[PDB]
Design a protein around this nucleic acid. Structure first.
Lengths: 46, 271
RNA sequence: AGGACCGAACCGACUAAUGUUGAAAAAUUAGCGGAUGACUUGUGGCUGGGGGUGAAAGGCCAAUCAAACCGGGAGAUAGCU
RNA sequence: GCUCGCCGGAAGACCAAGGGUUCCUGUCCAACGUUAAUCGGGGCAGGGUGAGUCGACCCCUAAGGCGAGGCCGAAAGGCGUAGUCGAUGGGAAACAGGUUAAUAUUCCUGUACUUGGUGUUACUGCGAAGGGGGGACGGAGAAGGCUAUGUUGGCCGGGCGACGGUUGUCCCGGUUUAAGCGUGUAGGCUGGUUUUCCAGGCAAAUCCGGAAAAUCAAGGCUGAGGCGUGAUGACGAGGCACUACGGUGCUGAAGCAACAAAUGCCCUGCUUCCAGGAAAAGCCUCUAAGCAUCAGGUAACAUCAAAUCGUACCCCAAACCGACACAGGUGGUCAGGUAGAGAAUACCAAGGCGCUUGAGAGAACUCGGGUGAAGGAACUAGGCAAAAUGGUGCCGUAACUUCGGGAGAAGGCACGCUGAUAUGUAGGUGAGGUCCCUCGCGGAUGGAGCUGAAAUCAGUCGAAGAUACCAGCUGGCUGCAACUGUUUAUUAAAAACACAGCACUGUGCAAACACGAAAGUGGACGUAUACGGUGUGACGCCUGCCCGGUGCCGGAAGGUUAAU
RNA sequence: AAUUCCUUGUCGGGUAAGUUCCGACCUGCACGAAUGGCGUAAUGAUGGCCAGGCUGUCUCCACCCGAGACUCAGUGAAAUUGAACUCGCUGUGAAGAUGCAGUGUACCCGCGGCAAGACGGAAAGACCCCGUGAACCUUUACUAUAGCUUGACACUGAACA
RNA sequence: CUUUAAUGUUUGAUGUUCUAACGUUGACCCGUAAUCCGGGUUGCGGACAGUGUCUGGUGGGUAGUUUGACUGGGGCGGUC
RNA sequence: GCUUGAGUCUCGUAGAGGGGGGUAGAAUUCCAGGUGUAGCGGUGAAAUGCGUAGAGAUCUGGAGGAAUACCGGUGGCGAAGGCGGCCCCCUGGACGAAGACUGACGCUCAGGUGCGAAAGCGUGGGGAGCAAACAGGAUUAGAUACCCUGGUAGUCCACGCC
C-alpha cells in the first residue's frame, strides 16, 4: 500500500518553504498570521 | 508507393505504408535544426485548450524557407528528406554561394534539379515568383497572403492553388477547399503542386499509430455524463437532442466565421 | 518485422478460501491477465474547486468528492428530535 | 561452543531518497520491548563521520519558475523581452593494499593524475554575451572480438582418515594483484596534400560552406581487450613465541595454463525501420573593436593553491511511508556452484538469519494440507473448489478463413544408466613446429593438448526414466464486442470506454475552437492530403421511405418589430 | 432474439427425463438499416449449453500430518452494560413475557461446547412517508445572465453620382 | 405654392474614389551583439474593422428558484 | 540442294490502328450584371415545376464538364472488342512497281497466355448535360409503367478488378 505522504525535502521546500511563502502576498499573509499566533516555527517545512 | 502489409498480426492486418526510397536515409542538416518541445493541450495558463493532443515521438523542427529569397542565385537540389512537422517532404537545396536551405518539395523535384526564386526566374516546378510574372491558369503552391510574409497557402502534401484571374493589382485564386479569394499580385508563389500526394493513401491500421502521431483518444459526449457534455446521460444509448460542441454551440451545420475585414478578399465561399 | 506467441523481473487484479474488534482503514495464500509497448518506472515541473483532469466510472484531485481541505460570515436556519 | 533448520536474483552486499546519532564502548533494567531479560534500535555517560580526485557547491542548459524595462488589468495582480534561476541530463582529475571498538577511493604505505596562480627561459599575433566545428543523442535486430566470472589440469602446502577400502590415476586448501604509463589491435569511420576564386555564415576571417586545377590510394581519427611496466612490491595456505584465550608480532611456498563465458565492454559501432529520434556550456578554430622589444598565446622547468559543506548508521527496512519492533509499499547497482532455456525452480556457496512468549496434551470444531474402497458431477444457481493435463525431439492434425491463421488443434511414439560406433565422434578452440613479409598485437600449413553435443546398435534396473521442484486440460454449438488496450485506485473489468476505419459539419490563417475580465497563449513555428466538433466503430454485403414538428443553411417581397 | 407480455409459444435435435441450449416457423405485446442492419476468420480472466478426461463436488464420509482451540506459567484487551436474587408452559398485556396471573419444574457454583431467545451487539433505517428541507442534474418551467448577434450614437474624415 | 442643365440653402439609404484618424500577428532601421515592446521609413487595408454606451433577438452555457393540499401510506384517478 | 510456300531489306502510299500531352469552335448548364414585363415550361389534353423577392426573352463578362455539327460515304483502319475536331511525340499493322537475300524456317493448335462493348466493383478525383433507383403530377378500372417535372449512383479521368 502506497500511502499519501512520500517525503522529499526539495519538493517540501519548493512548495511550503519560506521563500515560497514570501514570493506571494498570500503566503506573506500566512507568515503574518503565524507570527501573530506566535508559532515557534513559521515554515515547519524549513 | 503504397505498401499493404501482410496480416501477420492484428494491427498489421489493416495498415498501408507509404514509403519513398528517394528520401534521405540518415540525419538531417544540423545547421537548420531547432528544438521542438511538445506543448499541445497546454496554454500559458497551463490548461488544455486543444483536446486530444499528448505524447508522440520526439521531433526536431526544420527551418524551412517559406518566404523564399536569394533572388537570382540558382540552387541545386540535394537529397529529399523526411519532415515530421508536416505531411509534405522537404528538400535540402544548395545555393551557388554555399548556403543550404530547406524547401517544401514539389511533385516532380529530384536530387540534382535547379531551382531559382527571382523575378527573372524561368517558370518551372520548384521556382517561385510573384504572381505578375506567373501566367494565369498555372497551378502553384506555397503562396503568400502578403508580399514578403511567406507561404501560408497550399503547404500540405499534394495541395495546389489555381491562378484563376487577375484584377491588375490582385490575383484571384481557387484554393484546395474550392474557395475563390483575392490575393495581391506581388505575393510570391512556387510553381507546381506539393509532393507526397500519396500521403492521404496511408491507413494507420491500429490505435498505436495514432498515439505515435500524438493524438489522444476522443471520448464521445454520449458516453459522457450530463455534467461533462451537453450530450450524456440516459439509461440506454440514446441521448436525443441536437448535436453540439462540448461548450453548447451546434456542430452539424452552423457556420462560425465572424471575420469582417477579409470578406472583401474572399470572393466565393467554399463548397 | 509484429500495439506477434509462451513465460520470470516488472505492471496489474479474474476466481476461490482465509481474514472482517484483521498481520493489513483492501491484504495474505493458491491459481490468473499483460510482459517491445496505446508498456513500465525514478526525479523534477505544470493544470486549483462550478475549477482541474478524465481510453468516461460522476472516476480522481493527500484513507475526504454529484463539487476537496482550512479559516471566516456563524451562535446560518431548523414549524423537527 | 557443538549440532539442527531457513534464505541465498535474498531474508546477502552497496548506495539514492527519506530519517537524523538509531553507529561504537562503559553502565543500568523503573518505564519502552505484546513474556522474563543479565539483552536491546531503551535510560545515562563518553567517543566516533578526516577528501585537490566521491557527492554537493561550481560552469552549462530542459520542462518550468521569476522577470529591469514593456503590454495588459477597479486594486491585488496576469503575461512576457533582455536576463536570471532551475537536474532528473552535459564539462578536470586515484587506484591497490594496510589500519579503528566505531571513518575510509578521505587516515597510512606504494604508485599516480588533473585544473588554475606566480616566476624564469625559448619562440611567436594576441584579442568576443560574435561566426563555425564538436558536444549531440531513436527503436529493433544480428554478429564477431573480448572481459568480469567459472570449471579443469599443472604447481605448492597439508593429509594418509573413529567402520570394509583408500592415497602408490586419492582428499582439502591456495593458485590474487589495481589505477597510471608505454605499445595502438579484433574492429569502426573517413580520401588526403597543395594552389586559385567567392551572389553564403546578423560585419571580418587564414575557420565553416561552395566552385576550379595537379598528385598518389596512402594519410588521419576513434577503438575494447591483450602484452610490458607498476610489481625482486603488496597479498598469500600454513607455521613459529607470548595468552589476561579480545588476540599481537615475525616468517610466509606455488601464485601458471587450457577451456567455457555474459544481459557487461568494443558499441554513442554496424544493419535495418519509421514513429524520424534534447538544449547550452566545457573543448577546438576563426577573426571584429583594441595594443605593438607592451599586454597576451604556446613549450619546458620550478614553486604555490584546489577553499567550503556532506561523509557515523539503517536503507526488499524494527532507523523511510504505513498511530505499532505492523505478513503492506519503496528507485538503482553486484550477480558464485550443480541440475536447468533461464534473473524460473530445487539444493547449496560468500554472507545473513531461526521472524521478542514458552511448556505440555493430542477432544469437538475451525484453518492449511496428504491419502482413499465402489461409483464418477448423481453436488450445485453454476464442475465453485479440488482433481487432472503439463517438457524436448519426431510423426500427425479438422471445419472454417481476412490465406496470416485456426494449431502445441486433436492424437500418438522415444526419453534413465552402461558400453561400442568413437580407449571422446560431428563440431568448437588452437601450442610446439614449417614457410614468407617493411621481423610483430603480422600472414599461410598444421591439429599436440583442452572442450564436446546429438544419433544408432547392444546390454541392464525399477511398478514407474520430462521419475523431485517446475511445467496447458482438450473438443463441439452459440450470444456480444473485430482485435491489443482502458475503466468505477477500496463490492461491478464487462457486452461498458477507447480504437484503426467511415461519414457529416465548421474552418482561407490575426482560421475555427479553447483558456483568459484584457494583454496574450494553445491550436501551430501547422495551412484544407491541415486542424476542430459530432456520431458510428476492423472487415465483407449494404445503409431504404418521410423535411409535417424541432434544429441548421439559404432568400427578402410583404406583415410585425428596439434604442433613436 | 442482451429485444416475445402471453410463454415453459409450436416443431425438430440433444437427455430416461431439458422453463436453460442449438436449428427453425412468424402469431415482431414492443427488430430494423452509421441512435447503424445482417454476417464474419482470429481474439476474450466475457454470457449460455454440451461432451471426453479427471476427481471427497457428491452418495457418505473415514484416517492421518501441521496451526489454533484445551491445560499450565508470564503479560494482558474489546464491543456492550438502568439495576438484577437473570426457569418452562398456557393465558394476559403497547397486541410475540426471565420478571404479570395461574401452574409445573428446579440443591449452590464452574469448565468445555452449540447458537433457539434475550424483538442480541454495530450504524438517530439507506426502502416508504413527512419538512412550504438540502444538494446536484435535466428541460420546451419562471426570472435573470456570460457569450453570440442586430442597429443608433461616439472614436469617424474629404470628394463624386 | 408641386417642379428649373450656375446661384439664398438642409436631411436620410446604399454605390464609387481618396488619405488623414484607426488597424497591420507585411518588409526594413534604431533603442539593442532582444521571438517582447516602443519610435521611425514604407507597403497593404481604410472610415471599414474593432472598442465604449444604449438597444431588439438568441442564450440550460451558467445562476437563483418554483414545481399545492386532502388522501383509510404515497403515487394514479377524483376533489378544493 | 532449289524457290515456287514463309520471311527480311531498299523506296514510297493511304488510313477514326494504339498510347501520352496540348489546344480550338459551336452548344448546354451555372454565377454576376444591363434592358424589359406577367407569363415560361410541358402535353393528345393538362397538371407537378419555375416566375409577383423581376421568371422566360435579349445582351455582356466569367466558370466548369462532356462530346466533336459540316466533311461523312451501300467510306477507311484494327485479330476481335472497337476507333471520328485540330496539332505534336512515341509506336503497331497493311498494300505497291522493281531488285536482292535466307532457303520449308510452314499451317492448325487441346492445356497455357494475352486482348476483350456496355453495365457493374475497389481507391482517389471530377460532375455541364443525360439518367437506373427515388419523389411529385398525369393516364388508367387499377399503373409499383409508357408521358411530364425534377433528380442520386453512373456516364468522364488515373490505377486495379470483373
Amino acid at each position: 500500500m502506497k500511502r499519501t505522504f512520500q517525503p522529499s525535502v526539495l519538493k517540501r521546500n519548493r512548495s511550503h518553504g519560506f521563500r515560497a511563502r514570501m514570493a506571494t502576498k498570500n503566503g506573506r499573509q500566512v507568515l503574518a498570521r503565524r507570527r501573530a499566533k506566535g508559532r515557534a516555527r513559521l515554515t515547519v517545512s524549513k | 508507393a503504397v505498401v499493404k502489409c501482410k496480416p501477420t498480426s492484428p494491427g498489421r492486418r489493416h495498415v498501408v505504408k507509404v514509403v519513398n526510397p528517394e528520401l534521405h536515409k540518415g540525419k538531417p542538416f544540423a545547421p537548420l535544426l531547432e528544438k521542438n518541445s511538445k506543448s499541445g493541450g497546454r496554454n500559458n495558463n497551463g490548461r488544455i485548450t486543444t483536446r486530444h493532443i499528448g505524447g508522440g515521438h520526439k521531433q526536431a523542427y526544420r527551418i524551412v524557407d517559406f518566404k523564399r529569397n536569394k533572388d537570382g542565385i540558382p540552387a541545386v537540389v540535394e537529397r529529399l528528406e523526411y519532415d515530421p512537422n508536416r505531411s509534405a517532404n522537404i528538400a535540402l537545396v544548395l545555393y551557388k554561394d554555399g548556403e543550404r536551405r530547406y524547401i517544401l518539395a514539389p511533385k516532380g523535384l529530384k536530387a540534382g534539379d535547379q531551382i531559382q526564386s527571382g523575378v527573372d526566374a524561368a517558370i518551372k516546378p520548384g521556382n517561385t515568383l510573384p504572381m505578375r510574372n506567373i501566367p494565369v491558369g498555372s497551378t502553384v503552391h506555397n503562396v503568400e497572403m502578403k508580399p514578403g510574409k511567406g507561404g501560408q497557402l497550399a503547404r500540405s502534401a499534394g495541395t495546389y492553388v489555381q491562378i484563376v484571374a487577375r484584377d491588375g493589382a490582385y490575383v484571384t485564386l481557387r484554393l484546395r477547399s474550392g474557395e475563390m479569394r483575392k490575393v495581391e499580385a506581388d505575393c510570391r508563389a512556387t510553381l507546381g503542386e506539393v509532393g507526397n500526394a500519396e500521403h492521404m493513401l496511408r491507413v494507420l491500421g491500429k490505435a498505436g499509430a495514432a498515439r505515435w502521431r500524438g493524438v489522444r483518444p476522443t471520448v464521445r459526449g454520449t458516453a459522457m455524463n450530463p455534467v461533462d457534455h451537453p450530450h450524456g446521460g440516459g439509461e440506454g444509448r440514446n441521448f436525443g437532442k441536437h448535436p453540439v460542441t462540448p461548450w453548447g454551440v451546434q456542430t452539424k451545420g452552423k457556420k462560425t466565421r465572424s471575420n469582417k475585414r477579409t470578406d472583401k478578399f474572399i470572393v466565393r465561399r467554399r463548397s
